[PDB]
Structure 1
Amino acid sequence: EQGEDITSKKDRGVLKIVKRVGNGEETPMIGDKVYVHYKGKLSNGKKFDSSHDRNEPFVFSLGKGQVIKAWDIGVATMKKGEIAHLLIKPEYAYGSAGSLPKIPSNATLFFEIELLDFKGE
């Protein structure tokens, strides 16, 4: 439970640490096509998941609902070339319902995210 609370509500749901500093003044705007790599896991340590297992970047449009709340929030704070760690309570992820069989109810998740690039719609 180290790191900066990047939630709107300030409920320590989404905690971030920058591990490697990006560059540019610019963070992605809502609706940018965003290119990352990521290593992700449950905090209980029973499942792991990486962009690298698909040997290709992970692509998604920011704030257009295609990843969990925490990713839309977290990635909008990052600059090109930033590596960050996010620690994510279930309210910002898969909630009490979970997303079986991958994620159990009320799972806390961890990710390491490298923002590779972003381009305007």
Structure 2
Amino acid sequence: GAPATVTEQGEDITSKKDRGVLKIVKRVGNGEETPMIGDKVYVHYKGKLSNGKKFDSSHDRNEPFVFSLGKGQVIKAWDIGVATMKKGEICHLLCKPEYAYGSAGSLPKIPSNATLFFEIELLDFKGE
């Protein structure tokens, strides 16, 4: 499924090149430039465990998810992944636990040492 496709075909977008965050662009965005640090970003997302078990989707509640990029307001994989996106883009990310919830997890939905899959749509962003 989608997570395996990211394992096989995803680009390693980590600074360390440790495959901790792997990315596939599923829909090219028409925005010209990536957001800057501190920019307010607006996204929709789906989150699943790497085995395909869904844990959340912003669409369930018709609520864009909003945060300031590159400030540690979200798990590391998201600061890394969203920094690579263009407005209008949809990507798939596969995120090793080091770049997500680590050994603690986020119980009940996310176990210890979980690799996470996300689909992320960058709806918009605005300058810091």
Q: CA RMSD in A?
A: 1.1
Asked whether the 8 Å contact 2:38–2:127 carries over to 1, the reply is yes
> Unpaired runs of 5+ in structure 1?
none
1:1-121 mapped onto 2 (5 Å cutoff): 1-121=8-128
State TM-score, norm by structure 2: 0.90
Query: How far apart are residue 36 of structure 1 and its match?
Result: 0.4
Counting matched residue pairs gives: 121
> Unpaired runs of 5+ in structure 2?
1-7
CA-to-aligned-CA distance 1:70-97 (integer Å, 9 cap, x gap) = 0000000000000000011100000012
Query: How far apart are residue 46 of structure 1 and its match?
Result: 3.4
Identity of aligned residues (%): 98
CA-to-aligned-CA distance 1:93-116 (integer Å, 9 cap, x gap) = 000121222211100000110000
Runs of 4+ in 1 over 6 A off after TM superposition: none
Query: How far apart are residue 59 of structure 1 and its match?
Result: 0.5
Partner secondary structure for residue 45 of structure 1: coil
Measure, in 2, the Cα distance between the counterparts of 1:2 and 1:106: 22
Partner secondary structure for residue 109 of structure 2: coil
Asked whether the 8 Å contact 2:31–2:88 carries over to 1, the reply is no
Partner secondary structure for residue 9 of structure 2: coil
Measure, in 1, the Cα distance between the counterparts of 2:123 and 2:50: 25
Query: How far apart are residue 24 of structure 1 and its match?
Result: 2.7
State TM-score, norm by structure 1: 0.95
